[PDB]
Design a protein around this nucleic acid. Structure first.
Length: 140
DNA sequence: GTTAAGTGGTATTAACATATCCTCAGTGGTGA
DNA sequence: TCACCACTGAGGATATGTTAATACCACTTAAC
């Protein structure tokens, strides 16, 4: 209910403290990583300050930012002194994988290993990309 | 026979590439 | 021979589109 407006007020004050403290959003992610271990990317901080993330995510990142703003005010010099690695797919690999579809929608792990070795991609990367391919094709 | 773990299936989540934009530095047309 | 504001480009820093990656849940399967 009013949690929406309370989050919004917190986010506006958070923007004000970030601008006052002279920290970039990438620097905010770096500080969160070096003070908690869960380093976040600057896109998440952007979507936070603009209030773009979902409600559950909104509540999930509320406490970390609360702690950072309540702690970093003491000393900055010592603080100044674990990403969800997300490998990209280049266009020719994308085209080759699309070619691998339209014939066998759900390949076996035996074929998955061959596909991974053929295009030089990690097995887990190819497996998750295959799952998301199925997912977006089943959307429609 | 019951209960905990593995397997998928689908919803959320969060980072990448590139698209915009802020701000500051470098050059100069015009004026004095 | 001086000012300077206008004018614009560069790099860093934000907003987007988009999709790897994880995470939550129903179903089956293995252990005592």
């Amino acid at each position: 209910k009013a949690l929406q407006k309370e989050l919004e007020q917190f986010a506006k004050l958070l923007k004000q403290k970030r601008i006052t403290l002279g920290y970039t959003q990438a620097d905010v992610g770096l500080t969160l990583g070096v003070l908690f271990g869960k380093v976040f990317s600057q896109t998440t901080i952007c979507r936070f300050e603009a209030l773009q993330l979902s409600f559950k995510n909104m509540c999930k990142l509320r406490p970390l930012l609360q702690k950072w703003v309540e702690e970093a005010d003491n000393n900055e010099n010592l603080q100044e002194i674990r990403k969800r690695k997300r490998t990209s797919i280049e266009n020719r690999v994308r085209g080759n994988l699309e070619n691998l579809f339209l014939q066998c929608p759900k390949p076996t792990l035996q074929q998955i290993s061959h596909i991974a070795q053929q295009l030089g991609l990690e097995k887990d990367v190819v497996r998750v990309w295959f799952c998301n391919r199925r997912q977006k094709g089943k959307r429609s």
